[PDB]
Design a binder for this molecule. Structure first.
Ligand SMILES: CCCCN[C@H]1C[C@](O)(CO)[C@@H](O)[C@H](O)[C@H]1O
Length: 765
């Protein structure tokens, strides 16, 4: 049954718009295969098209906004794009039609509507670019009857090992096609759909913009050569219209020019399936997908008071679809430093200068290939896999489709190396690398990241104890399926746990340091004077100067999270030998959080260092870090420590702002200093952990039940209203929120853990 379910999931999720880095494109979950991408741009002059043309995602003044209105990666969805520069409201509908043995079929409608400010006679170029990698695969544009290009549909027939036989059709579409009366029309046609079929070495096929411009430029050079000049120039759109040359190749460029509004379809027909897909199929499946999305949303994301209104529902749908609609498939080599230089052990004072010296040896090399199936923080700015982000992204996704989430966990855990390391940032392939400065590409095997994917595993453990529809929950409906998944993942989890302990260990024994356990103490590797990138809270203030005797209460809490998980999963597999070990680790972390990290004088948790005089010193900076044992679910409901944290969480002059909890307290000397990333702004991921823990305390007998209930109520309201208010004003989710003004700031399109707001609204943790 497990294998059966495995196979149905593979066939179900194979195809998608899995290229989140571009406005619209498709590719299957196969490294070297068929990929498509859309481009468009107005043409007004002889030189504007190069500046107007859209392909990879961006966010600036000339783009109003864009995003998925509805999406489900089993069925497809609809994306809206509001382009001010090109005067166009674009819509791209995508739909999957299950069938055959090769992952099924799919279709897309592309619709462009000029906005109110565009000239009614705007010319717009639209290109559908298609490429295929693979040694023994073939793709061929059937040539047109007509001399100079196509009056109707363009049909590409192809074959490969992974897809078998298939046909990909770009329809003629609806809309006015401009006509040139120039002499050029004798050799180039008066204006029509054209195809160029080309070949390049497989590894550059992703470079669609340059490949296309190299063809445009060759066209313009042909004009110059054949005496078409400024005495009497062809119209711009004709100058940028490729000469028709369909054929066989691993690249096919299909180019249309439209005057005014347009629309056209793309129909991918898997030959092994029924009859080929048609436009009338597309329209039906589109309408159907929406119905299904609507029904599932209302059930899984049942917004509770005071967010029951339709305004909130539209908001929740937008935040959710953008999160799930970011899922991408990535494939290629990544840049890793595998020197294991000994400077990276950071055992001396001043270690940061040493580690920089080793970095400047530049011993990094490309390795893999790797593949990854993952959601992403931000389409225009962070279109790739981030380890601790991914745990937050999957919490809402798992609610919607637990099997999709488990698939993404599996994907991430299959990257893990023999030591138990997964790189915090997955930059796979030249395409992914293109959008990332070289200095920032290299991954370091001593860098951890918060293990937030354990949070998702925890939700799945609890659910397991207590056609597309069936597939989405098959891992909890079939209890032997679930346990098998856990049996196979479990050794990897254990390895990650052991890896943390060997690589991110702090030093008790070697200092005058007293504590319940000799073993349990942690220090994030990777810190510079100014930063601690690996903890995820980049510039949150830490002991100065950084020092080999530092201990980090965040990191120790993340270890608590992990043991708790390994206890539940261990139990389920009756790994009683292991369960007993974890139980003692937990017990010790519980004690050592107190002995090493608790400040009586301050009433909160603190990181620790070693003095000038070699003594242990707490260094307290009140903010997210201070609450960590609480955020991560390690405190008993009656703990007096918990009571004191509830005081600090609730205190307006410290963390509590009208807009959510501040990353750092207004009292700390580092409030609003430096780059001010984690030194005052309100962050939805950490607020989310707070809300979940307040709620937990609120719904059990104990001395803080009602303080927690008051805080839960108000923080849930403040968080959701902050994000909603900004969405309404700007159309964006943002990375963080300003505690003084409420405004969203930094990275836009941040879906992204900001989307956790859909789970907060729907409550019932
Ligand atoms: C020098 C670049 C640092 C930017 N990091 C922020 C974005 C992201 O890295 C991806 O969402 C998160 O993983 C971090 O934790 C955030 O702080």
């Amino acid at each position: 049954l497990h294998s059966e379910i495995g196979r149905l999931n593979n066939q179900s999720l194979l195809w998608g718009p899995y290229r989140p880095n571009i406005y619209f494109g498709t590719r299957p979950r196969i490294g070297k295969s068929l990929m498509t991408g859309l481009m468009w741009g107005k043409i007004e002059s002889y030189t504007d098209f190069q500046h107007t043309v859209r392909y990879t995602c961006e966010q600036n003044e000339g783009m109003k906004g864009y995003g998925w209105d509805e999406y489900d990666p089993r069925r497809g969805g609809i994306q809206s794009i509001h382009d001010i520069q090109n005067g166009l409201d674009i819509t791209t509908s995508f739909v999957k039609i299950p069938g055959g043995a090769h992952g099924g079929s799919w279709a897309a409608r592309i619709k462009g509507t000029l906005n109110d400010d565009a000239p009614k006679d705007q010319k717009t170029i639209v290109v559908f670019y298609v490429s295929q990698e693979g040694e023994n695969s073939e793709l061929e544009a059937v040539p047109s009857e007509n001399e100079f290009g196509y009056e109707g549909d363009v049909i590409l027939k192809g074959r490969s090992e992974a897809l078998g036989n298939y046909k990909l059709v770009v329809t003629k579409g609806k809309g006015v096609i401009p006509q040139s009366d120039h002499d050029l029309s004798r050799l180039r046609g008066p204006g029509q759909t054209v195809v160029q079929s080309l070949t390049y070495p497989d590894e550059v096929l992703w470079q669609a913009k340059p490949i296309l411009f190299q063809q445009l430029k060759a066209g313009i050079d042909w004009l110059v050569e054949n005496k078409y000049d400024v005495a009497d120039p062809p119209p711009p759109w004709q100058v940028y219209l490729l000469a028709n040359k369909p054929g066989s190749g691993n690249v096919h460029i299909v180019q249309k020019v439209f005057e005014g509004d347009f629309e056209f379809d793309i129909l991918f027909s898997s030959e092994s399936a029924g009859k080929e897909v048609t436009s009338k199929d597309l329209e039906r499946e589109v309408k159907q997908a929406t119905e299904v999305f609507g029904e599932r949303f209302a059930r899984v994301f049942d917004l509770k008071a005071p967010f029951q209104g339709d305004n909130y529902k539209k908001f929740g749908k937008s935040m959710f679809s953008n999160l799930i609609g970011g899922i991408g498939y990535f494939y290629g080599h990544s840049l890793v430093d595998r020197s294991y230089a000994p400077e990276y052990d950071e055992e001396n004072e001043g270690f940061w200068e040493d580690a920089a010296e080793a970095r400047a040896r530049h011993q990094e090399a490309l390795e893999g290939p790797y593949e990854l199936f993952t959601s992403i923080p931000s389409r225009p700015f962070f279109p790739r896999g981030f380890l601790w982000d991914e745990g937050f992204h999957l919490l809402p996704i798992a609610d919607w489709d637990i099997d999709l989430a488990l698939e993404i966990i599996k994907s991430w855990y299959n990257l893990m190396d023999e030591d138990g390391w997964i790189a915090r940032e997955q930059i796979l392939g030249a395409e992914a690398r293109s959008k990332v400065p070289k200095e920032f590409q290299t991954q370091y095997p001593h860098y951890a990241n918060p293990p937030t994917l354990f949070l998702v595993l925890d939700n799945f453990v609890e659910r397991l104890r207590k056609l597309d529809e069936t597939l989405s929950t098959a891992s909890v409906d079939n209890p032997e399926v679930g346990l098998e998944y856990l049996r196979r993942l479990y050794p990897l989890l254990r390895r990650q746990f052991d890896w943390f302990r060997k690589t991110q260990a702090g030093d008790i024994k070697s200092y005058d340091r007293e504590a319940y356990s000799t073993k349990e103490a942690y220090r994030w590797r990777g810190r510079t004077v100014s930063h601690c990138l690996t903890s995820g809270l980049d510039d949150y203030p830490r002991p100065q100067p950084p020092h080999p005797g530092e201990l980090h209460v965040d990191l120790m809490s993340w270890v608590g999270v992990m043991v708790k998980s390994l206890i539940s999963i261990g139990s389920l597999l009756g790994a009683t030998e292991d369960v007993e070990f974890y139980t003692k680790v937990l017990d010790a972390i519980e004690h050592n959080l107190d002995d090493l990290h608790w400040s009586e004088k301050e009433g909160c948790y603190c990181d620790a260092t070693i003095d000038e005089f070699e003594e242990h010193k707490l260094v307290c900076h009140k903010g997210y870090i201070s609450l960590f044992p609480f955020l991560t679910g390690l405190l008993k409901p009656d703990s007096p420590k918990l009571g004191k944290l509830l005081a600090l969480i609730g205190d307006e002059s410290e963390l509590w702002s009208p807009y959510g909890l501040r990353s750092l307290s207004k009292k700390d000397e580092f409030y609003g200093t430096a780059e001010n990333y984690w030194r005052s702004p309100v962050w939805i991921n950490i607020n989310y952990l707070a809300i979940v823990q307040l709620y937990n305390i609120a719904t059990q007998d104990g001395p803080y039940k009602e303080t927690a209930r008051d805080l839960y109520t108000r923080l849930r309201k403040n968080i959701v209203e902050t994000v909603y208010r900004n969405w309404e004003e700007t159309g964006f989710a943002w990375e963080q929120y300003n505690p003084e003004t409420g405004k969203g700031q930094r990275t836009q399109h941040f879906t992204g853990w900001t989307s956790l707001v859909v789970k907060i609204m729907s409550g019932h943790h």
